[PDB]
Design a binder for this molecule. Structure first.
Ligand SMILES: *Cc1c(COP(=O)(O)O)cnc(C)c1O
Ligand SMILES: *Cc1c(COP(=O)(O)O)cnc(C)c1O
Lengths: 385, 385
């Protein structure tokens, strides 16, 4: 009985957190309702009430995704985790996997792809690039993939990817379409079923304004078949779709314990879905598009140039901006934070050092926040050497 | 422009959650401070403040684990996830893995083990069983494992596993010791370094009283070596130790984005560690042991028998109780909930149908909660057919 480690003096102080206006690519600031849900008491993780809450979230994801797929649920992990879940259940080792690598995200899909032993074929594009129906038909014809991954909202580049008909294309060639909508969901049009998407995921901490840590996923008929008929077991227990599906009530069988869901994160997630259900999807889309419209105008007035030249390809939720010559982008970002308590970001992955990223997300996608970031940047431009 | 799915009428109602006294095996009820942290606003996931909070949590885990291992951090997932993280970084396919399968947990380790292609050797015992220094030397001598898994607090059976010297045993035979302390941490003595433990994990939602969804993990010198020198990449990106270690500041390199940590869950986790740092580890141990002592006395007075006969083997945090003959265990559990708003549980895995499980966890491990559960059960016994 004698202790190596003594109580950490830091823990003996009270928790203190500064106030910040988060106008980077995410996570975003939480509205009052979501914070309130966050502060609530626990119920039983397998209680009848928890299942009710979970059932509502499912309906919520079906609304925001625009799908009727029964195989739709929450992944108990961040965005990445939902991607990993998708890839680990859909791809058996040796399966051919076509990856739209126009930014960090396709990179991450590829990385995961290699790790789980798929034959990974990366359609690589420079940051700023998007994919045409043809490049995909071409890559599809050449490598005969079981799955294609596409980033809808490329948050690393500010690119909005077209999506239209790609699923139809992919269904000829009998290939599955996997789409990343973590950054795009809620702030730009998206219809899972109508666009024939096989696997769609998104994240909690973007336009939904919930805390980071959960993610959203849905699987088509085709996906469900491939996953339930694989010969091999997926490398992951935590992310195994058969178990997850059962516990989320997507089965005929009674719910069986798998892992303990993040009850409190779910309260918040539910509220975030409640909020956007009340606003309404198309309304939310207009707001992001209009906010984004306003923001670009202000930026160019400052003498800044937008990284993505064709406005139809510009992701409304995350805006990229070329680093103004002569300026140390690091200084600008620090300046905005130091003098304004506002977070903006640099690049990420290929776009590193090449851009600034400003985000308009959910209830934070407002004209008034655009004015704040515009003025903060202006001051930055004025004073930074 | 026309929508398959309309806003779910359920989401249009306000979030409502009943009041419950959770006295099952977990998750437990949250104290005011943890709820308060839960309701706070977001800061930047890579902000200097977030890293500070993260650094404190690290010190906190070093305190509760009693270790000085630099490779210590939070897994952004539930308990299971921390186990999966451990197994996926430590075991290369074909590696020999010895698993103490005395309940659901060793089962889960084995399941994961098979999935990631290890040669899994299960030392199976009936629920209620524990492992002697010798059975391990024996299994160690026979299969020459790279790793052994042991469940400290077997929450499925109520068994407290001995631990002492096992790491020394395992270090001869050059094998790593992996211990599950999700249920045991904070409510019964545990010293990572002093007991020569190579991989220790625990969970947020047990004696720590934080919400489920994060987990705690630490790696010894030996573990760190094996993981950093493997030839193959682990099957998981999300759980890859090299990336995780870097972002948690365990490296010489600046922190590089990997995934977005669950900022808010971390506020809460920090507070939960702050709380037990203030109480003090040994204090916490006495309380759980004494509460447990009180609880067993009351139960036997009701004519109930404890599943685990030797009191020295009884896990204080989770207590198992044989199903009283003539009684439908399902009725008892429902009765306790319906008439008292108290959650208790049945078995789990091998102990299914065979027991009831009552939990004493952190600030919920109190005499007064013991009186409440005793009286609730008594009434149940009286009225159930
Ligand atoms: C934010 C984001 C993710 C999620 O990554 P996490 O940090 O794990 O949530 C995935 N894809 C894209 C395009 C994103 O913007
Ligand atoms: C609760 C518990 C876990 C964690 O499982 P999760 O539900 O994923 O947190 C792991 N091991 C034991 C022994 C436990 O009691």
């Amino acid at each position: 009985h004698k202790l190596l480690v003594t109580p950490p003096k830091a823990l003996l102080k009270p928790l203190s957190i500064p106030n910040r206006l988060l106008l980077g690519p995410g996570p975003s600031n939480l509205p009052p309702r979501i914070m309130a849900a966050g502060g609530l008491q626990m119920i039983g993780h397998m209680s009848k009430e928890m299942y009710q809450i979970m059932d509502e979230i499912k309906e919520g994801i079906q609304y925001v995704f625009q799908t009727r797929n029964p195989l739709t649920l929450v992944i108990s992990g961040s965005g990445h985790c939902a991607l990993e879940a998708a890839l680990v259940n859909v791809l058996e080792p040796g399966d051919s996997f076509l990856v739209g690598a126009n930014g960090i995200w396709g990179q991450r899909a590829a990385d995961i792809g290699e790790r789980i032993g798929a034959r990974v074929h990366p359609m690589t594009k420079d940051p700023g690039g998007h994919y045409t129906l043809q490049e995909v038909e071409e890559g599809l014809a050449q490598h005969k993939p079981v799955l294609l991954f596409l980033t809808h909202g490329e948050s690393s580049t500010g690119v909005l990817q077209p999506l239209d008909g790609f699923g139809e294309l992919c269904h000829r060639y009998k290939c599955l379409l996997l789409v990343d909508s973590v950054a795009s969901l809620g702030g730009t049009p998206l219809y899972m079923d109508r666009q024939g998407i096989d696997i769609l995921y998104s994240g909690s901490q973007k336009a939904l304004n919930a805390p980071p840590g959960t993610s959203l996923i849905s699987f088509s008929d085709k996906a469900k078949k491939k996953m339930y008929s694989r010969k091999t077991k997926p490398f992951s227990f935590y992310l195994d779709i058969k178990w997850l599906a059962n516990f989320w009530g997507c089965d005929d069988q009674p719910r069986m314990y798998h892992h303990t869901i993040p009850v409190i994160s779910l309260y918040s997630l539910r509220e975030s879905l409640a909020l956007i259900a009340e606003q309404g999807l198309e309304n939310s889309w207009r707001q992001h598009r209009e906010a984004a419209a306003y923001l670009h105008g202000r930026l160019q007035a400052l003498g800044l140039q937008l990284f993505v030249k064709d406005p139809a390809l510009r992701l409304p939720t995350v805006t990229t901006v070329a680093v103004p010559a002569g300026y140390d982008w690091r200084d600008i970002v620090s300046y905005v934070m130091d003098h304004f308590d506002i977070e903006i970001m640099g690049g990420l992955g290929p776009s590193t050092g090449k851009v600034l990223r400003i985000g308009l997300l959910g209830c934070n996608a407002t004209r008034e926040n655009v004015d704040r970031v515009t003025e903060a940047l202006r001051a930055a431009l004025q004073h930074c050497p």
